[PDB]
Design an enzyme around this catalytic site. Structure first.
Site, PDB file in Angstrom:
ATOM      1  CG  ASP A 194     -31.690 -17.580  23.598  1.00  0.00           C
ATOM      2  OD1 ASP A 194     -32.753 -16.865  24.414  1.00  0.00           O
ATOM      3  OD2 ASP A 194     -30.994 -16.783  23.192  1.00  0.00           O
ATOM      4  CB  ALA A 195     -33.404 -20.095  19.581  1.00  0.00           C
ATOM      5  CE1 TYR A 196     -35.615 -16.377  16.471  1.00  0.00           C
ATOM      6  CE2 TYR A 196     -36.755 -17.065  17.666  1.00  0.00           C
ATOM      7  CZ  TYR A 196     -36.851 -16.477  16.752  1.00  0.00           C
ATOM      8  OH  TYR A 196     -37.157 -17.447  15.853  1.00  0.00           O
ATOM      9  NE  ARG A 208     -32.011  -9.701  21.920  1.00  0.00           N
ATOM     10  CZ  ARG A 208     -32.512 -10.754  21.741  1.00  0.00           C
ATOM     11  NH1 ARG A 208     -33.667 -11.156  21.177  1.00  0.00           N
ATOM     12  NH2 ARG A 208     -31.847 -11.720  23.031  1.00  0.00           N
ATOM     13  CB  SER A 264     -35.831 -19.733  21.906  1.00  0.00           C
ATOM     14  OG  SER A 264     -37.147 -18.913  21.221  1.00  0.00           O
ATOM     15  CG  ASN A 265     -38.312 -15.981  25.549  1.00  0.00           C
ATOM     16  OD1 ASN A 265     -39.161 -16.587  26.490  1.00  0.00           O
ATOM     17  ND2 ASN A 265     -38.282 -14.297  25.566  1.00  0.00           N
TER      18      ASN A 265
END
Ligand SMILES: [Cl-]
EC number: 3.8.1.2
Lengths: 226, 225
Positions: free
Chosen positions: A11-13, A42, A119-120
């Site tokens: 996952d990135a963020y 967030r 990622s999203n």
């Protein structure tokens, strides 16, 4: 557990890129409200992701980010909302890597794993951030929810990763900082490893973790191969 | 549309029932993180409802309430969690109504409207909360997401309201304080009215509101048939 995996999916963020730095890098401009703003930004960006998929009204992650930021700036009745939105979207577009991200990915790539992001974020905000922190060069593949117009933890996006990377769920090690993303990934079938930097309490017990560690660098003992 | 409406459907938790009161009434026992702890509990309750429904792992609202409270109390490293958990759970089990909930519901019912709750709450928690706050006897129906094992705002929940109430989407006035819930209902077809008590900025704009009021009592001038 046992170790014949072909893939490490990140996952990135919040896992490889530090979102806190968005508002931190600009805390003086925001004023004493900075933490609270950061926190509401967030939470809403994620709310908008989850509700929008449940109500069947996808929009891309960047517009969510933008929408969520605007909401949070108004909530806090900030002066110069125009300026702050510019300063802060920009800082988001170029989030800094956690100090260990690059090296640990380098170590995994050169260990023969497929190393990928799931990622999203739409490729644009994602590409800019991987370019800015130079993680461009340590990745085999970078997969976006925007390709399906569906948000995590919907099982289709974990599925799309198997499809694109050509692997089975259990040949994946899914690494993330977000208990909900790990719960979703695990329920789907990935081996889940949680990066838990501050030691927050556990959630999503029905999709148990394979391991928790407190740093990207600890992934290396966890996964290094003979 | 303005007045070919046959039904007012209310959200419970946060719209007719006051969730602040759970912590607020125990603030002194909780300490200076009360108001933090209260937000974290609200945000996590809902997070679990949405993400579980997305990953196909339903558990009912009481359980999620419990999990979120546990998570919140731990996060704040609070002391006497055990006793703090019973006090706060009981407070939630019997949440007190907004000052005006009773009257405005009872006025709406007796103006001839079908008057219903559509909630995430499961029956036991919802009934206990409606009994205790005396909102029970001024409702034609109480409809629970736990009959479907699917949470707001997946369309099927709002569909359930139509089905059980035997009305069409455009015949329903959907009252709530949550933008996302309003979003969901809006997009599905209800006419939406937001009770925006504290003057929060807009959200979910693609599903615009019929009206906004700052109080449940302002619903009466507006809906007199
Ligand atoms: Cl679904």
């Amino acid at each position: 557990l046992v170790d014949s995996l072909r893939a490490c999916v990140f996952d990135a963020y919040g896992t490889l890129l530090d979102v806190h730095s968005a508002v931190m890098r600009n805390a003086d401009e925001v004023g004493a409200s900075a933490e609270a703003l950061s926190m509401l930004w967030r939470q809403r960006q994620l709310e908008y992701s989850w509700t929008r998929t449940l109500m069947h009204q996808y929009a891309d992650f960047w517009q969510l980010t933008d929408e969520a930021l605007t909401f949070a700036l108004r909530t806090y009745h900030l002066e110069d909302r125009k300026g702050l939105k510019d300063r802060l979207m920009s800082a988001y577009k170029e989030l800094s890597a956690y100090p260990d991200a690059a090296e640990t990915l380098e170590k995994l790539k050169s260990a023969g794993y497929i190393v990928a992001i799931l990622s999203n974020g739409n490729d644009e905000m994602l590409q800019a951030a991987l370019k800015a922190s130079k993680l461009d060069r340590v990745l085999d593949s970078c997969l976006s929810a925007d390709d399906l117009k569906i948000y995590k933890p919907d099982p289709r996006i974990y599925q799309f990763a198997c499809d694109r990377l050509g692997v089975n769920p259990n040949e994946v090690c899914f690494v993330s900082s977000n208990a909900w993303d790990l719960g979703g990934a695990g329920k789907f079938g990935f081996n889940t490893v949680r990066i838990n930097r501050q030691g927050n309490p556990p959630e999503y017990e029905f999709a148990p973790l394979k391991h928790q560690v407190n740093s990207l660098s600890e992934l290396w003992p966890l996964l290094a191969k003979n």
